[PDB]
Amino acid sequence: AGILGVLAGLFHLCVRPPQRLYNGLRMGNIETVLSSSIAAVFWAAFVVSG
Amino acid sequence: GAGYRQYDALWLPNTERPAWLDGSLPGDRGFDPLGLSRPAEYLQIDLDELDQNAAVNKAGGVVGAFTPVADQVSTDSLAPYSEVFGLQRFRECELIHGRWAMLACLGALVQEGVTGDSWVAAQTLVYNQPQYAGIDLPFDIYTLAVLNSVLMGXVELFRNSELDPERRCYPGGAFDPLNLASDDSERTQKLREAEIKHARLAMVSFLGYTVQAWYTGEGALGSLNKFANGF
Amino acid sequence: GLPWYRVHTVVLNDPGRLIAVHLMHTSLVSGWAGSMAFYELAVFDPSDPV
Amino acid sequence: ALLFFFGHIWHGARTIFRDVFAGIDADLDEQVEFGAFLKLGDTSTRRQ
Amino acid sequence: SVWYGPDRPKFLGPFSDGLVPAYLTGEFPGDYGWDTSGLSADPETFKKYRTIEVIHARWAMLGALGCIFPEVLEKYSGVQFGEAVWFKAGAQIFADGGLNYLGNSGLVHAQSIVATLVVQVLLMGAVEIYRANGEGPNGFGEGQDTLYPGGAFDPLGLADDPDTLAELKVKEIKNGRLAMLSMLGFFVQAIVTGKGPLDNLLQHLEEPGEFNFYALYANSLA
Amino acid sequence: AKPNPNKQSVELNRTSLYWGLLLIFVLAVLFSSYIFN
Amino acid sequence: MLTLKIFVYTVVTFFVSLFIFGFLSNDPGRNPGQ
Amino acid sequence: LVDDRLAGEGTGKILGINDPSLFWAITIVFTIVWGVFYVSTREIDAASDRENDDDFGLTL
Amino acid sequence: DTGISTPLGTLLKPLNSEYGKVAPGWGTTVLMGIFMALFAVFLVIILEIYNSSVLLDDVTMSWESLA
Numbered sequence: 099a100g101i102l103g104v105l106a107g108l109f110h111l112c113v114r115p116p117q118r119l120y121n122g123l124r125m126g127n128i129e130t131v132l133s134s135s136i137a138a139v140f141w142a143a144f145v146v147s148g
Numbered sequence: 149g150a151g152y153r154q155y156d157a158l159w160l161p162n163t164e165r166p167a168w169l170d171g172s173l174p175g176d177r178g179f180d181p182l183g184l185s186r187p188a189e190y191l192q193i194d195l196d197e198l199d200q201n202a203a204v205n206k207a208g209g210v211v212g213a214f215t216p217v218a219d220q221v222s223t224d225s226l227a228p229y230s231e232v233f234g235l236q237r238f239r240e241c242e243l244i245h246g247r248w249a250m251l252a253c254l255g256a257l258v259q260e261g262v263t264g265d266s267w268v269a270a271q272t273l274v275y276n277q278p279q280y281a282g283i284d285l286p287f288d289i290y291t292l293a294v295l296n297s298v299l300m301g302x303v304e305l306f307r308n309s310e311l312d313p314e315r316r317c318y319p320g321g322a323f324d325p326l327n328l329a330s331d332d333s334e335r336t337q338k339l340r341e342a343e344i345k346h347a348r349l350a351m352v353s354f355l356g357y358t359v360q361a362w363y364t365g366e367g368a369l370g371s372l373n374k375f376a377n378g379f
Numbered sequence: 380g381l382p383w384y385r386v387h388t389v390v391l392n393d394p395g396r397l398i399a400v401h402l403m404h405t406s407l408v409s410g411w412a413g414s415m416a417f418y419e420l421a422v423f424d425p426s427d428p429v
Numbered sequence: 430a431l432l433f434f435f436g437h438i439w440h441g442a443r444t445i446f447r448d449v450f451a452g453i454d455a456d457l458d459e460q461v462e463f464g465a466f467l468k469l470g471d472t473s474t475r476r477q
Numbered sequence: 478s479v480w481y482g483p484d485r486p487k488f489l490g491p492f493s494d495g496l497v498p499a500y501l502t503g504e505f506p507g508d509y510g511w512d513t514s515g516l517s518a519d520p521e522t523f524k525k526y527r528t529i530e531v532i533h534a535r536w537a538m539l540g541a542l543g544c545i546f547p548e549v550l551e552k553y554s555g556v557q558f559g560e561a562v563w564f565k566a567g568a569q570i571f572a573d574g575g576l577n578y579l580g581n582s583g584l585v586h587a588q589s590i591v592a593t594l595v596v597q598v599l600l601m602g603a604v605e606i607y608r609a610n611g612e613g614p615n616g617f618g619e620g621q622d623t624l625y626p627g628g629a630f631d632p633l634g635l636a637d638d639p640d641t642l643a644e645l646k647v648k649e650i651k652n653g654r655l656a657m658l659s660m661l662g663f664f665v666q667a668i669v670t671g672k673g674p675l676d677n678l679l680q681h682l683e684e685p686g687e688f689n690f691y692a693l694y695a696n697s698l699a
Numbered sequence: 700a701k702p703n704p705n706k707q708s709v710e711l712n713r714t715s716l717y718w719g720l721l722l723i724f725v726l727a728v729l730f731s732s733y734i735f736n
Numbered sequence: 737m738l739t740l741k742i743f744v745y746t747v748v749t750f751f752v753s754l755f756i757f758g759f760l761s762n763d764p765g766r767n768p769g770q
Numbered sequence: 771l772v773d774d775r776l777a778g779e780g781t782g783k784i785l786g787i788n789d790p791s792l793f794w795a796i797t798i799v800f801t802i803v804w805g806v807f808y809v810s811t812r813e814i815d816a817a818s819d820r821e822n823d824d825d826f827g828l829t830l
Numbered sequence: 831d832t833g834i835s836t837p838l839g840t841l842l843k844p845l846n847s848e849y850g851k852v853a854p855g856w857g858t859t860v861l862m863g864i865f866m867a868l869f870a871v872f873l874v875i876i877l878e879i880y881n882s883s884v885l886l887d888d889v890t891m892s893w894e895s896l897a
């Protein structure tokens with residue numbers, strides 16, 4: 099997972115997001131980051147509880 | 149004029165050179181099926197309205213089309229090049245990768261011949277007990293790790309200080325003591341072609357090395373021996 | 380004025396103060412970890428681990 | 430985890446529906462007329 | 478300045494007015510007016526003697542530091558050389574373990590006297606040919622002073638001002654003359670006492686009125 | 700540097716104060732009965 | 737214990753040398769006098 | 771004995787130095803600070819717009 | 831009113847310079863969808879392994895695998 103994370107981080111450093119995805123997900127807003135992070139953390143909470 | 153055929157040669161017998169590859173670079177074979185060096189076009193999206201004092205806060209629209217100019221080096225120390233997808237930056241990356249791969253291939257072969265250990269187990273053997281050609285070194289592994297990090301960082305920070313994109317690949321000067329390809333002639337072009345071909349061959353060969361050790365569990369000479377003693 | 384449930388939205392468009400409030404949260408979490416460790420050490424009885 | 434599921438739902442709704450956080454437009458009757466446009470909310474498909 | 482011209486200090490104090498020659502006009506560093514034997518009347522021989530003196534000064538400074546360093550590092554430290562005394566440190570090349578740098582069996586570990594001599598001959602001959610010719614490999618160091626080159630030999634740029642350069646020249650020549658006198662002292666002390674330069678200093682400091690040349694060795698020298 | 704342009708003032712009216720006090724005291728009743736055990 | 741002594745000696749001499757060589761650096765000239 | 775200790779209390783050592791390591795630490799740090807201070811004295815003196823002749827200093 | 835200059839801010843400035851730069855069109859959405867599908871398949875496989883809905887020869891899936 100660390101190796102894959104490094105590779106994906108390099109990809110996301112090099113490649114710009116698509117225009118359609120940018121507009122759809124509102125990548126210029128920070129509340130979308132907040133919502134996605136909250137989703138990830140509650141997923142992780144369910145996994146660790148199980 | 150006998151014993152062969154008279155016959156620019158591309159990577160396919162019948163194919164056309166891409167527009168962005170004009171054949172001026174040394175190893176230019178017109179090979180770019182994915183078009184990674186094609187001049188990229190982008191778009192500019194206006195800033196989102198996030199004002200808390202306004203009734204309506206709409207998203208950002210398209211300001212207009214925007215195609216940047218690449219292959220320009222600046223004094224940034226963290227992003228010197230104008231764009232990631234440029235031909236010159238890709239050439240510099242290819243040259244550095246190839247030189248490292250050439251050194252790696254030769255060193256793995258020579259170390260395997262001299263010491264008798266595989267190039268994979270050599271890392272662990274040196275980690276447990278630092279050595280070189282059977283001679284125990286006077287340094288501790290912690291000191292060696294810190295020294296390697298510091299020295300490599302200093303060398304690469306020295307290398308990054310150049311600003312001319314041409315001299316970023318062929319610095320010359322103290323790195324060409326014999327003055328073999330330090331002018332502008334046909335003799336330097338052939339040497340650059342040979343260097344780029346050797347770089348590509350060594351890159352493919354070390355990808356070999358790595359995969360072969362992954363699959364068969366052997367090194368380079370070990371893989372040769374295992375292949376020979378299998379018929 | 381702002382309702383009591385919208386107070387922390389002032390740092391939505393302020394990267395510096397967003398970093399500041401995140402740093403404050405990290406400080407509080409680390410302090411809780413240290414204090415909880417000390418409190419558990421003050422009441423632990425390692426005489427019998429069986 | 431349950432409370433944060435609710436939080437995710439709330440914040441996603443707030444970030445997508447950001448322009449109508451204070452209220453809907455004053456005149457919003459032509460777009461919400463049944464069978465006025467072929468496509469829902471599209472004013473360029475006025476038929477049927 | 479203070480160290481140049483007709484008002485510079487002289488080597489006899491107030492008695493030096495009537496002894497200074499007419500060619501020692503105070504133009505070069507270290508000029509104190511000492512030419513009683515008249516060996517520098519010829520300007521060419523004077524220039525050659527100045528070059529010889531500066532080279533001797535640099536070599537003597539290096540030699541004094543290197544003669545006193547390993548002996549200090551062997552008593553007031555944890556280093557264990559094969560031999561720390563300067564006039565007995567050449568015999569380490571004939572030891573069973575060879576010559577180990579800083580007492581470490583994996584630092585230099587030199588074993589053959591002939592190989593070190595050959596390498597030294599090659600390197601020192603090359604550098605001294607470059608210095609004498611005033612012209613290094615591939616035209617390196619051309620047009621520079623044959624005694625104060627600068628440039629590649631001044632990486633830190635401490636001599637980029639002529640006045641600072643003159644003052645540093647005076648400092649260098651005075652330190653070098655002191656080092657030359659100290660190395661002569663080292664030689665004669667090694668001959669007479671037979672102990673290291675630091676041993677003599679420590680023994681003198683143990684009892685200055687009892688452990689000196691006159692109280693120990695003077696009467697046995699005739 | 701210049702004053703922060705994101706300055707806002709909070710507010711709370713008497714109805715909100717009464718609702719908050721009522722919520723606090725009712726929760727206190729219920730969970731105090733359950734916590735004293 | 738000797739390592740602690742060496743570290744403390746280094747720190748103390750560093751601070752005392754700073755004090756001495758700061759008070760030697762033309763201190764009676766850092767005043768708002770005309 | 772049962773344990774080990776430095777055993778230096780009430781001995782009367784010069785500057786408390788029972789070790790060349792301590793001597794080297796003191797000397798190295800002092801020399802470094804002095805060397806850093808030495809090169810700046812010409813610049814510091816020039817901040818008063820006066821030469822360091824026999825009349826220099828704060829006088830009354 | 832440009833801001834407050836700082837050596838570290840100047841060092842990190844190029845990393846925060848392209849706000850709205852986007853790739854025109856759909857970009858690399860299909861590749862990301864392929865990766866998403868592979869991730870979903872992997873998650874299903876591991877969930878079924880834990881749930882004991884799939885049985886593997888060498889996987890004990892019990893406390894006895896600590897032996």
Ligand code: CLA
Nearest residue numbers: 123129130133134137138141437438440441442444870874
């Ligand atoms: C309970 C219903 C639910 C609802 C209504 C929403 C609603 C929303 N989500 Mg959230 N979300 C949920 C659960 C939910 N989510 C879960 C469980 C996760 C996983 C952690 C997420 C993670 C998530 C992310 C990462 C993002 C959102 C965002 C969004 C917004 C729109 C985008 C969206 O449609 O995503 C699609 C949501 C789906 C749940 C539909 C997919 C249906 C799945 C793939 C079913 C496929 C079936 C399955 C493979 C069958 C076999 C399984 C079997 C072996 C058990 C909106 C607020 C997006 C956003 O705009 O945020 C600002 C975004 O960034 N969500």
Ligand code: CLA
Nearest residue numbers: 136383384385386387388432433434435436437439440443
């Ligand atoms: C990951 C962290 C996180 C973050 C950074 C935010 C951030 C934000 N939230 Mg969201 N939210 C989250 C998770 C998060 N939320 C979750 C899990 C939920 C579901 C419960 C919500 C539900 C939610 C609502 C319903 C609202 C927001 C709103 C807001 C904004 C203002 C909040 C406010 O000012 O409160 C100020 C809070 C108080 C004055 C006191 C609250 C005290 C609570 C009741 C208990 C005391 C808490 C305790 C000390 C610490 C908690 C422990 C920890 C384990 C959680 C801000 C952008 C507001 C909005 O959208 O603004 C436009 C809003 O209306 N959020």
Ligand code: CLA
Nearest residue numbers: 658659661662665666669670677678680681688689690691
């Ligand atoms: C350059 C400075 C210098 C310094 C600091 C020293 C320092 C030392 N010498 Mg050495 N010495 C030197 C040069 C120097 N010497 C020279 C040039 C020679 C050859 C003539 C000698 C030959 C020598 C011998 C034969 C002996 C010493 C010994 C000693 C110790 C003093 C006891 C003694 O009887 O001295 C007497 C000194 C000499 C015979 C000549 C010194 C002449 C120089 C030019 C004087 C430097 C002046 C001095 C620092 C201050 C004035 C004091 C004095 C002149 C009244 C002391 C560690 C003694 C020792 O090791 O005992 C344990 C001892 O046995 N030295």
Ligand SMILES: CCCCCCCCCCCCCCCCCC(=O)OC[C@H](CO[C@@H]1O[C@H](CO)[C@H](O)[C@H](O)[C@H]1O)OC(=O)CCCCCCCCCCCCCCCCC
Nearest residue numbers: 741748752755756778779780781782783784785786787788
């Ligand atoms: C003398 C030059 C002065 C130059 C200028 C000095 C400026 C000073 C600035 C202020 C510094 C104050 C803090 C100093 C801390 C370091 C010292 C320390 O802790 O040492 C503590 C150490 C203790 O050393 C101990 O020794 C033991 C064995 O004896 C063991 O080895 C212990 O392990 C070891 O710690 O003591 C010394 O180093 C001795 C110092 C002796 C100083 C003599 C000075 C002589 C000249 C001055 C005479 C007058 C002095 C004043 C008298 C009247 C006072 C009212």
Ligand SMILES: CC1=C[C@H](O)CC(C)(C)[C@H]1/C=C/C(C)=C/C=C/C(C)=C/C=C/C=C(C)/C=C/C=C(C)/C=C/C1=C(C)C[C@H](O)CC1(C)C
Nearest residue numbers: 511512513514515533536537540543544563566657660661
């Ligand atoms: C001035 C005048 C004037 C008038 O007119 C006249 C007259 C008088 C003549 C004059 C005078 C003169 C003089 C005095 C001189 C002197 C000199 C000297 C002493 C030198 C030395 C000189 C000296 C010197 C160089 C020295 C050197 C040294 C060295 C290198 C060393 C080395 C080494 C070492 C490190 C260590 C090891 O282990 C060993 C060895 C190897 C050994």
Ligand SMILES: CC1=C(/C=C/C(C)=C/C=C/C(C)=C/C=C/C=C(C)/C=C/C=C(C)/C=C/C2=C(C)CCCC2(C)C)C(C)(C)CCC1
Nearest residue numbers: 403404405406407408409410411412413414415416417418
């Ligand atoms: C200044 C400083 C310092 C100090 C510091 C300190 C001392 C700190 C502390 C800190 C701390 C000491 C902190 C703490 C914190 C805590 C917290 C933050 C907590 C929280 C909690 C909570 C939030 C809870 C909740 C709850 C409840 C109430 C009940 C049940 C449920 C729950 C769980 C929800 C020093 C000198 C070092 C260094 C320099 C600076």
